[PDB]
Every structure is written in C-alpha cells, then in structure tokens.
Design a protein around this motif. Structure first.
Motif, PDB file in Angstrom:
ATOM      1  N   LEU A   9       0.779  -1.144   0.026  1.00 25.88           N
ATOM      2  CA  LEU A   9       0.065  -0.012   0.065  1.00 25.88           C
ATOM      3  C   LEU A   9       1.074   1.136   0.060  1.00 25.88           C
ATOM      4  O   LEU A   9       0.464   2.121  -0.584  1.00 25.88           O
ATOM      5  CB  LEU A   9      -0.946   0.116   1.313  1.00 25.88           C
ATOM      6  CG  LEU A   9      -2.470   0.340   1.355  1.00 25.88           C
ATOM      7  CD1 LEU A   9      -2.896   0.236   2.640  1.00 25.88           C
ATOM      8  CD2 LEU A   9      -2.714   1.818   0.735  1.00 25.88           C
ATOM      9  N   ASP A  10       1.710   1.367   0.918  1.00 27.99           N
ATOM     10  CA  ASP A  10       2.635   2.415   1.139  1.00 27.99           C
ATOM     11  C   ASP A  10       3.912   2.661   0.274  1.00 27.99           C
ATOM     12  O   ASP A  10       4.286   3.799  -0.214  1.00 27.99           O
ATOM     13  CB  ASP A  10       2.873   3.028   2.432  1.00 27.99           C
ATOM     14  CG  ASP A  10       1.838   3.963   2.965  1.00 27.99           C
ATOM     15  OD1 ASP A  10       0.898   4.306   2.323  1.00 27.99           O
ATOM     16  OD2 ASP A  10       2.243   4.636   4.118  1.00 27.99           O
ATOM     17  N   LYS A  11       4.447   1.601  -0.044  1.00 28.60           N
ATOM     18  CA  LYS A  11       5.825   1.662  -0.804  1.00 28.60           C
ATOM     19  C   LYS A  11       5.287   2.449  -2.060  1.00 28.60           C
ATOM     20  O   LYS A  11       6.282   3.292  -2.859  1.00 28.60           O
ATOM     21  CB  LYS A  11       6.065   0.446  -1.258  1.00 28.60           C
ATOM     22  CG  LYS A  11       6.087   0.093  -2.948  1.00 28.60           C
ATOM     23  CD  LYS A  11       5.566  -1.277  -3.250  1.00 28.60           C
ATOM     24  CE  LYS A  11       6.741  -2.195  -3.375  1.00 28.60           C
ATOM     25  NZ  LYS A  11       6.745  -3.314  -2.430  1.00 28.60           N
ATOM     26  N   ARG A  13       3.617   5.314  -2.164  1.00 38.72           N
ATOM     27  CA  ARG A  13       3.889   6.625  -2.255  1.00 38.72           C
ATOM     28  C   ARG A  13       5.409   7.053  -2.307  1.00 38.72           C
ATOM     29  O   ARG A  13       5.678   8.261  -2.734  1.00 38.72           O
ATOM     30  CB  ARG A  13       3.651   7.186  -0.681  1.00 38.72           C
ATOM     31  CG  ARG A  13       1.988   6.996  -0.498  1.00 38.72           C
ATOM     32  CD  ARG A  13       1.798   7.189   1.162  1.00 38.72           C
ATOM     33  NE  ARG A  13       0.314   7.257   1.280  1.00 38.72           N
ATOM     34  CZ  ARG A  13      -0.865   8.147   1.097  1.00 38.72           C
ATOM     35  NH1 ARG A  13      -0.543   9.303   0.641  1.00 38.72           N
ATOM     36  NH2 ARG A  13      -1.951   7.653   1.765  1.00 38.72           N
ATOM     37  N   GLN A  14       6.380   6.255  -1.980  1.00 38.59           N
ATOM     38  CA  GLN A  14       7.535   6.602  -2.043  1.00 38.59           C
ATOM     39  C   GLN A  14       7.948   6.422  -3.420  1.00 38.59           C
ATOM     40  O   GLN A  14       8.822   7.035  -4.093  1.00 38.59           O
ATOM     41  CB  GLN A  14       8.712   5.547  -1.385  1.00 38.59           C
ATOM     42  CG  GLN A  14       9.887   5.780  -0.889  1.00 38.59           C
ATOM     43  CD  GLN A  14      10.807   4.943  -0.228  1.00 38.59           C
ATOM     44  OE1 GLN A  14       9.958   3.803  -0.244  1.00 38.59           O
ATOM     45  NE2 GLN A  14      12.040   5.113   0.076  1.00 38.59           N
TER      46      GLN A  14
END
Lengths: 135, 135
Positions: A9-11, A13-14
């Motif tokens: 999910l968040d990787k 955003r990077q």
C-alpha cells in the motif's frame, strides 16, 4: 490481492513522481490489473497505465478528486456510470496509445469537460478512412 | 494482536501527514482497534480515532512525548492508571463527537492540563439536564 500484497500500500507513495508539467503522476506497466491501493493516493493528477489487460475502472476512482490526466497505453478499459460521470466532470486531457480500435474506449465521445485528446497509432484502414473518428 | 504485526514504523511513516498548523497528525477510521506500532511514531503530535469500538488505551502511549491533541469520534475508551497519568501531564486538547453518554469516557474530568474541550452531541438527557458536565 497478491498484487496489492507484493506491491505494498505505502511503498507506492515513495514511488510517486512529480513530473515535468508540475503534476504528480504515477506510472504503472504490465500488471494483471489495477491495485486497489492506487485509489488511496489522493494526491494524484496523472495516471499512466501500460499494457494491462481486461481493465474495469472501479467507482473508488471518484476518491481521486484532483485527477486531471489519464494515459491508457495499450490498456482497454470498461466503466460504469458513477465512475464514468466522475471522469466526465473531472478530466482535462486524455492520451491513448493503441494497436487498433479495441484499445479505444468508446465512451470518450460522451465526455464533456475534455480539453486535450491525444491518439497514437494509425487511425485508418484500407478503404475505411476515418470511420474510427466519425464521433 | 496481529494488527501490531503489519502497521510498522516504516509503513505508518509514509502514511503520516503534517497538517496546516505544522503538526504531525494521523487519522484512522473504522479499524478493529489501535495498532501498537502507532506509538513508536515518536514525532506524532495529534491522534485521531474515528468509529473504532471497544478501545483501551495501552501504556505505550507514554512514548509519544509530543502529543498535544486527541480526537475521539464515537469511540469509548478505557484506560488504566499509568497511561492515565501520562495523559494527565501531557495533553492540551480533547475533541469528542458522540451520540450519547456511553461514548463519554468518565476519566476526562480527572484531567488537569487540558486547554481545549470540544463536544459534539446532545449534552442533556430526560430530567437530567447537564448532569454529563457537572464535573
């Protein structure tokens, strides 16, 4: 599920990028579908989809209130009325790179707020000039 | 318990947001509880809990040395003495959005450093006007 798990999910955003036109974009390619984690990335303005088969746009695209561009490169797409209306009201430019007509979504001519259309590919066939663009 | 296995410092980090007042905040809704990994995000200053049932505040909240605000939207919360003492000594604001008295923690009136209180809901009951706020 496996896709959303392996591409966390968040990787994502990077992984995002603010592009040359000062628009926040995400570029995706050669996946089996659209991860549902995409539609939590509320900051988005440009979505690129490359070589993804059998895509249907879900209603959660209405969460992406700031979306201004969609690029469908060899990615056929289907859609239902709520998401479709959201895109009718909240889009400025559309880019399509296609092999033939089957990668052209038929709903594009029912759009109303579009400001740019970009088609990449031969628009003509033998003895059938510009039938594809009659609309 | 297995919630504390997935959210992590790294994962939660990218999800965090620095708000308009330059305060680091996290907003969560509709989870089964509080991940314990939340409380290792030592820079956090505002915690928001929305529509989460049967919450108990654990002692690890003492790690959030910079906490200033807590928002409890329809979330009754139990707590024991150590975490309670930390919150007595290290809190400036409390927001509550509630349906009725059952979502009002009884311990709030034993606090001492609060500077703002925000209540959303009917503060009165039949023949019991303002009993909720006598304290």
């Amino acid at each position: 599920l496996n896709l959303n798990n392996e591409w966390t999910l968040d990787k994502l955003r990077q992984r995002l990028t603010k592009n040359a036109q000062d628009k926040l974009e995400l570029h995706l390619f050669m996946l089996s579908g659209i991860p549902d984690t995409v539609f939590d990335l509320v900051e988005l303005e440009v979505l690129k989809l490359e070589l993804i088969p059998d895509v249907t746009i879900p209603p959660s695209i209405a969460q992406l209130t700031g979306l201004k561009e969609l690029w469908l490169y060899h990615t056929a797409a289907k859609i239902e009325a709520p998401a479709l209306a959201f895109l009718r009201e909240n889009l400025r430019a559309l880019h399509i790179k296609f092999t033939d007509i089957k990668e052209i979504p038929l709903w594009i001519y029912s759009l109303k707020t579009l400001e740019e259309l970009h088609l990449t590919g031969n628009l003509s066939a033998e003895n059938n000039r510009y039938i594809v663009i009659d609309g």
